[PDB]
Symmetry: D2
Subunit: 121 residues, 4 copies
């Protein structure tokens, strides 16, 4: 299992120790408070009012938690994944990432605390 | 395992099929958008910019997801619980509850989708 | 999870720390060598070439591992149960027992080693 | 998980759909009756009274269930493995094999039924 923090201002995100292998079932729980610039903070689902101005993940709000598995495209995590299995032919290390516009992470703040584990399968 | 909705304006909470028994380990993941009044909506962590005016759970923000197990006091859930074990002498039906001030539920809207599962022990 | 030994000579059997509750999924793995009287020893499946002369469990061979959940009747365990749900409504402490005819346990010998845990549900 | 059968006269063994990966925890439960040549049949622990005359696994009796993980050596399975981690960092597909002397499988009969699953990690 893996337990850690994902920094909102980290454009490259956080490569965890979790290698998602074919057939794996995983569970992720994410918590905390982060900002993509404003004084205000949002949780791992991000800001439902802010427009997508070129986000690394277009299927989640600005300020949401997302991930990559190996060299996959971005996949929404939001508050977490419950006994989740990946789409075909997706595998590799899980990288966790705050959803913002590339080049605009510098004014970000806060973090999410995240637990990942493998479930029975 | 249980999957269901928890309505923000339901003061009674939502009873799930989950009976928490001594020794049980559980995982909860909660998602979605709800309001305790304002036209704006918050995820399962609630509104961190709002004061506690006599909330059912003082250990969570207003608009947060909370729970009771049998006749326990309120326990925070927020975005979820990862492989969690209850305090001794806490057991019975899990009821999920939106965190608000009692009697002020009428102006609430939205809801959270919540998965609960028992883990290996 | 529980690990312990079940003696062939114990007509009372072995209480475990596992309480089976409705909806629980369990796994048991049993190993070792025992006898209901003969010099030869058998594993937890017992002796397939021996007639049933009034065994505590008619659905398993003489010398097999069986169990009770609370005050249920006997349920075969044999070498174990993989991610098993009680097919009947039963509840309570699992007790493990060597399958022999009551009062004939005085010539029995050996024991089985047994692991039991609850699985995700 | 994988649910299948292992035939006593299959010298190569049965390749399963389970790929053991680094960090995996597995549970195996095996049942049934088989023979390495005699009339009698034995369970997945094999015959504790038969000498080792060059068995493919020296850590298990003749007629026992064993396996290989990738190009590992033979690993005893017997009645099964409870929440088990592979030693020495072995990894790869799990192949299940009846323990007998190489070239003497031709007179074998019966089978074991086997369940394999991955556990939480
Ligand atoms: O839309 C994303 C964008 O939102 C605001 O304009 C922020 O101040 C920028 O840093 C960037 O995060
Ligand atoms: O702080 C609790 C309180 O918050 C706001 O004022 C809402 O209008 C009320 O309905 C109540 O939910
Ligand atoms: O059938 C059961 C019976 O089997 C033999 O007769 C044994 O010697 C007895 O002690 C009893 O275990
Ligand atoms: O020791 C193993 C050996 O045992 C007997 O002699 C069998 O007939 C052989 O086929 C072989 O399985
Ligand atoms: Ca920004
Ligand atoms: Ca309200
Ligand atoms: Ca006896
Ligand atoms: Ca043979």
């Amino acid at each position: 299992a893996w337990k850690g923090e994902v920094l909102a201002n980290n454009e490259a995100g956080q490569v965890t120790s979790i290698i998602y292998n074919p057939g794996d079932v995983i569970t992720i729980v994410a918590a905390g408070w982060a900002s993509y610039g404003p004084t205000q903070k949002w949780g791992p689902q991000g800001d439902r009012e802010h427009p997508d101005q070129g986000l690394i993940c277009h299927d989640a709000f600005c300020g949401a938690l997302v991930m990559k598995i190996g060299n996959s495209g971005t996949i929404p995590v939001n508050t977490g994944l419950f006994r989740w299995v990946a789409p075909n032919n997706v595998q590799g290390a899980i990288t966790l990432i705050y959803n913002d516009v590339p080049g605009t992470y510098g004014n970000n703040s806060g973090s999410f605390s995240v637990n990942i584990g493998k479930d029975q399968s």
